[PDB]
Design a protein around this nucleic acid. Structure first.
Lengths: 83, 96, 99, 517, 105, 107, 103, 97, 80
DNA sequence: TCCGTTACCGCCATCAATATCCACCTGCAGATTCTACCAAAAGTGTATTTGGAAACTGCTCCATCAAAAGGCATGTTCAGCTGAATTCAGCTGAACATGCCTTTTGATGGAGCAGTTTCCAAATACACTTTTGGTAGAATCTGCAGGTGGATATTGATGGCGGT
DNA sequence: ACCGCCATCAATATCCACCTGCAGATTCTACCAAAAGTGTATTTGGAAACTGCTCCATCAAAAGGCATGTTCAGCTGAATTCAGCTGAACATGCCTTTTGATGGAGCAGTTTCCAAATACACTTTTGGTAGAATCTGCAGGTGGATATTGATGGCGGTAACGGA
């Protein structure tokens, strides 16, 4: 079923922990929505590459191989799942 | 010897430019810029088609593979124009 | 009477603690629901394997981690400790992702 | 000499490609400059000095240093300012300046720097008072007189620089700079002994009987030095030395009113013909490295209780000058403020109520008291002087010594003065000149002009006169003109710390000799 | 007797594209219509570039194409901005731009 | 010989026929040289040797006897050559190096 | 007294004019002979007795000219971000760092 | 019979190469994926430069020279020469035996 | 010969003027010269390797173009 | 304390020198046209194998219902602080004039760059045989995580000894 | 009473040692489908040897740029203050985890079949290098018409002041 509004599922403690991991001492209260908007383009690009790979193979199941070889050409090569 | 084959896209680019603009000229460097551009684009498309074809253990590369490469490299707003023109061209070629 | 640790002293605790741990910090169910509803736009009735969602999660988590120190150094460059979205915009534009 | 001077020559050699023109002797025939022998009388290069020192043709390293400076001077004189050879020679000389000093210091010398005095101004008979500026053409008269070229309607240029003097020790026989060692003939008529000879024999130099502390003491100077010492002890600076402030001149004079005011008021009898006053001059000395150094001096004019009105019961600061050599640097402004506050407190205790300050910054190339100000000593702006005086006055008010301070305009408005007679009259002040140039129209013009310049002048409200300090007649320093002339004639400059100390000890010797022949 | 370009109505030498694909060694076997699609895509792209260059030249009161017009046409379109994000245009210069904060007062 | 393989002939533990078969099936060319695989296997083995050496010291100093991705991340990030070679590579479970600026310190 | 000041421009006025003039010009800026000498001297380290064609030197000059303009444009945004007008080296160092070429 | 298709991996070669330097150090299955991905990336890249230089020379024969040039071009710094040395000696001994 | 003074003060000033810089600090030139040198060395090494591969004693723009294309710096105009 | 007087400060006004703009004239090289010539490339025809596709059957694993719960998410209050505005104070590159220089363009002497032909050594293909590496199956051993007790750095609060 | 620096005490948090339970690592046994080394025949791109032939490297004139010297004012840095901001702690209630079972469309394997790429032969064309002739938009040169900055003064607004 077509659900919506899952970007709010990224809880405030999660973003706070992410910022703390980066060495940030003081965090402003207006950058969370900015990051939520920024992630949109990256997620859309990744899903577009993955769905293009899946549709080219005429398969109805999406595999991690399509995702990893799609990320390879974007300059984000990943190690750990073969390839 | 001295007249060895050095084929390029000099005449084709000029004759294509003729229709879009009759009173327009391209002196010396625009030809080189467009030749480098088309060579780079062809290299990217051919390489992407080749790798995606190899990613499926297929010994034959058809228009579908290069079409997928084009859709991959060219985003939606150019992708729809590319797929429409390619489908119309292939249908016209097959019908004739 | 509460200890009332001075501001900025507590941050050292978690900056030391988190750098020694690598466990995932994002819940799996909201992420899989989000990716399902996002990918439903291009194609419907899709089926996804168990490993695909976790692979996408661990491939997309690294981008923010790699941007965090860049934004921190950009903010420190302005003689400030607080980070602003303009730092992220500047980093993205110089990196060539935007312009 | 070889083993000690060769590091500097090798450092000069390795500066590629700076030393390449000087690596080989200049050949005019193969360089397009055949007139070189016409310009340079002694053409020689680095290889010649290397050959000379290898064969031991130098009696002392001073000849080697002099030859290096000689080739540098020849290269500078021949090549033009914008030529690359000039730049090469300049930076080679700069590098040699830092390279040669440690060798001479280790060998027992003072320094190996070619130091020359400032170019002296040359008097001329064109207008009986014209002074030849630096680097100016003139017509000579058998080297005994000079005349200016502009007013003329042998010819030379004012580019001659007097070299620094040298003194030879009576035991070791080495020749070195007199200013660096701080040796004076009158202080030590028996001769000059270097520090190395004294250290070898465990001897000590004779106590200086020409020091500032041995000068006759004054109550005002004693109060000033006591206040400065108390403030310094309260600060407790480890690098701080001992500061002595002494009054050296105190003489009674009279100031004559100019004829322009004589016709307007003196002829009518509304004001006195002349004002008697007592002028006092004092200098501040600090002991650095066991050597007295002058770092602050002033000239003031005090009007006694017998002075006719409106000049009754007041003081005025004629001039102010200082050198930026006090230690510590941070407390120099504090010490100057303390000296000024002490002087104001002393004159208040005497009874004085009004004080006048003219914050006129010195012009470029013009020295108030200390001749040849250091190049690093920036000229204060009029705004800077006003802020400094305002801070000093605020500090004085905070000590319950000064009731208040205003500008001349506010003081005049509060005093409700109407005529120019009530305006203060001082020797050499700007107001008499302004009034003379102007000559109720005069009152309005004076009001407007003084309102325009109200920021520069400061008036201090402090609240018969008897002076316990005896008079000290001294014509060598009756005004800054004689002191400036003596400093210029004897090349007593304050550009460097050593030169400033030498000037200070020369002043102390001169004062001691003139006080008691 | 009849060329393939005349049959397909394409201006580019579709035979040369097939010949290049044969010696390019991308695959031991190739399709007959794939070079047609590739040539059509290349023709569409170069037509876009040429018409943008012509518009840029006409927007400068000039009748001759210069690399400055090419750079202006490329940099004025966001799709070409992202597409040629790493490509440098010869003698193209940069777009004029001044920041508002840098203006006085 | 019937017992001396080409891999043992060149004294390399890495296989030599597998990479040759991969090159043949990769459709890179219709002609594949015999000397390429022996050169390529040595380079691959040597690169593996450096990555193992740089992982070993990072594993030893932590009082650990088991390989962890943190050791690999430390080995990659502390070398100015591997970082330049692999500057666009993301490693899972690697993290980032600690970094504290002097300005942010409570001076 | 005296007569002076025929026409004196305010500071920074001519800067905008020269920026506008230079932004409409596309000619080269670096002299060819010093660049040729520098390229020859750098190439001497690798191999000796080498001959270089003019077209390659022109291509290298264009490539090196474009990169400096790109880095300057990148550092301009960093400089304006810090609420500063003067250009500081730290802008250049951080622009190099963010581009990822310092790894 | 009916059995699933086999899979290929370099587990034995990696296991052998770990033994010579660190006999006591153990290796877990997690790092094998990263190692295989990295070695495959290196192999495909270096094959890419080798084939590209072969195309540049228009040579129909693939040999040690273009892969040598690819090793020089790709690996930065003296590490490249490092590999070259071993690679060189390898082929030499492969010619000797 | 040093041959690094060829980048003169007016040249670097005019080059920086393209970015809209109004005030230029006096110590920007050394590090930008170093960056220029280290960036040019990387491509010169690649060009030398490419030339040495072809057994040719003369360098060509072909080697430069296909050495720059691998760094994501494809150049248009010199490919023909 | 309020009104006449005055000087200071600032709004706005025509202009002076400079720069930018358009309009006309003149001589020149690239674009356009035309002609002939000829070899590499594209068209058809025939036979042959093979790769994707058809129908069929068997194996599989993911969504949803379902329950018990303890720890983390959210609301409320209290307080310490650090960024923005103000004023002031010191200084270096912008704007001119002046003497001096080396970019840019003009024809050259010999070592690599092709051209051609023939012979050589490695590449490829077909057939046999043994065999190392993946794996189904199973049995056996152990370092690592967690619980509990003990000992030690670390920090804030009521005072205490120096300057103000 | 403040500001620095500090000994002492009670409470937190961490590191370490001893002990115990268990999933993952290690090793026989064997497997026939697939790989590699060996034994022959044949063919083709490159090297050696000779030649003819250009193109990079090395000197000379005249003046628009290049380096020095002088002065200054908007620019940058420092000390001070205040109030909305976030961080911490405590109480109360919902939310994800795990395990079990079930149904069937999607995926994989098998055989045989049909149209298309490819190796030859043949011919008829079409664009590139060659030449010549012709024209026309464009780079300098000159001449007048308006737009821009800015120092400067006439005069209004205003604050300060002094006598009534």
């Amino acid at each position: 079923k077509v659900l919506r509004d899952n970007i709010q599922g990224i809880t405030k403690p999660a973003i706070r922990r992410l910022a703390r991991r980066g060495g940030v001492k003081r965090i402003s209260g207006l950058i969370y929505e900015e990051t939520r908007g920024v992630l949109k383009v990256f997620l859309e690009n990744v899903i577009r590459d993955a769905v293009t790979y899946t549709e080219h193979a005429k398969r109805k199941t999406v595999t991690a191989m399509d995702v990893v070889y799609a990320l390879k050409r974007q300059g984000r090569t990943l190690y750990g799942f073969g390839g | 010897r001295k007249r060895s084959r050095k084929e390029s896209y000099s005449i084709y680019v000029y004759k294509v430019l003729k229709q879009v603009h009759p009173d327009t000229g391209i002196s010396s460097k625009a030809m080189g810029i467009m030749n480098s551009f088309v060579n780079d684009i062809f290299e990217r498309i051919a390489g992407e088609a080749s790798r995606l074809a190899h990613y499926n253990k297929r010994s034959t590369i058809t228009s579908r593979e290069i079409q997928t490469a084009v859709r991959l490299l060219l985003p939606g707003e150019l992708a729809k124009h590319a797929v429409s023109e390619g489908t119309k061209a292939v249908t016209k070629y097959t019908s004739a | 009477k509460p200890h009332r640790y001075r501001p900025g002293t507590v941050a050292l605790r978690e900056i030391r603690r988190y750098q020694k741990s690598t466990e995932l910090l994002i819940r799996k169910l909201p992420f899989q629901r989000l990716v399902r509803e996002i990918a439903q736009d291009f194609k419907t009735d899709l089926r996804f394997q168990s490993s695909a969602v976790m692979a996408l999660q661990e491939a997309c988590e690294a981008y923010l981690v790699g941007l965090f120190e860049d934004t921190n150094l950009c903010a420190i460059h302005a003689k400030r400790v607080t980070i602003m979205p303009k730092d992220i915009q500047l980093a993205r534009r110089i990196r060539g992702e935007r312009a | 000499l070889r083993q000690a001077l060769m590091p500097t020559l090798e450092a000069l050699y390795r500066q590629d490609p700076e030393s390449l023109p000087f690596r080989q002797p200049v050949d005019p025939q193969l360089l397009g400059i055949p007139d070189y022998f016409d310009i340079v009388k002694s053409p020689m290069d680095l290889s010649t000095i290397k050959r000379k020192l290898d064969t031991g043709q130098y009696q002392e390293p001073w000849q080697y240093v002099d030859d290096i400076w000689l080739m540098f001077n020849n290269a500078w004189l021949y090549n033009r300012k914008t030529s690359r050879v000039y730049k090469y020679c300049s930076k080679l000389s700069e590098v040699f300046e830092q390279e040669i000093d440690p060798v001479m210091q280790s060998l027992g010398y003072c320094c190996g720097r070619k130091l020359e005095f400032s170019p002296q101004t040359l008097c001329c008979y064109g207008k009986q008072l014209c002074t030849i500026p630096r680097d100016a053409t003139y017509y000579s008269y058998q080297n005994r007189y000079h005349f200016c070229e502009k007013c003329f309607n042998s010819k030379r240029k004012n580019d001659t620089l007097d070299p620094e003097l040298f003194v030879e020790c009576t035991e070791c026989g080495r020749k070195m700079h007199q200013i660096c060692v701080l040796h004076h003939e009158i202080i030590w008529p028996a001769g000059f002994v270097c520090d190395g000879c004294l250290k070898k024999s465990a001897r000590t130099r004779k106590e200086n009987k020409f020091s500032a502390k041995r000068l006759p003491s004054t109550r005002l100077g004693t109060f000033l030095e006591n206040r400065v010492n108390d403030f310094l002890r309260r600060q407790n600076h480890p690098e701080s030395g001992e500061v002595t402030v002494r009054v050296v001149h105190a003489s009674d004079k009279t100031v004559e009113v100019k004829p322009g005011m004589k016709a307007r008021f003196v002829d009518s009898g509304e004001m006195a013909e002349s004002f008697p006053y007592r002028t006092k001059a004092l200098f501040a000395f600090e002991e650095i490295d066991g050597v007295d150094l002058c770092f602050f001096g002033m000239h003031v004019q005090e009007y006694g209780s017998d002075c006719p009105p409106p000049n009754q019961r007041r003081v005025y600061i004629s001039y102010l000058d200082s050198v930026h050599f006090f230690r510590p640097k941070c407390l120099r402004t504090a010490v100057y403020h303390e000296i000024l506050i002490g002087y104001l407190e002393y004159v208040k205790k005497l009874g004085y109520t009004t004080g006048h300050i003219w914050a006129c910054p010195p012009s470029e190339g013009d020295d108030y008291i200390f001749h040849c100000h250091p190049p690093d000593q920036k000229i204060p702006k009029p705004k800077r002087l006003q802020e400094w005086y305002k801070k000093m006055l605020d500090k004085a008010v905070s000590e319950r010594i000064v009731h208040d301070y205003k500008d001349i305009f506010k003081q005049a408005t509060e005093d409700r003065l109407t005529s120019a007679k009530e305006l203060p009259y001082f020797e050499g002040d700007f107001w008499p000149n302004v009034l003379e140039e102007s000559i109720n129209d005069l009152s309005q013009k004076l009001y407007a002009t003084m309102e325009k310049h109200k920021e520069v002048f400061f008036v201090i409200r402090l609240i018969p006169i008897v002076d316990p300090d005896p008079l000290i007649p001294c014509d060598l320093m009756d005004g800054r003109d004689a002191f400036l002339t003596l400093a210029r004639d004897k090349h007593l400059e304050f550009s460097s710390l050593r030169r400033a100390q030498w000037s200070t000890m020369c002043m102390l010797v001169e004062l001691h000799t003139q006080s008691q022949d | 007797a009849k060329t393939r370009s005349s049959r397909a109505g394409l201006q580019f030498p579709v035979g040369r594209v097939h010949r290049l694909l044969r010696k390019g060694n991308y695959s031991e076997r190739v399709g007959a219509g794939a070079p047609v699609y590739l040539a059509a895509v290349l023709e569409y792209l170069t037509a876009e570039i040429l018409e943008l260059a012509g518009n840029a030249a006409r927007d400068n009161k000039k009748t001759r194409i210069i690399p400055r017009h090419l750079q202006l046409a490329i940099r004025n379109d966001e799709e070409l901005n992202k597409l040629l994000g790493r490509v440098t245009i010869a003698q193209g210069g940069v777009l004029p731009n001044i920041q508002a904060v840098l203006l006085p007062k």
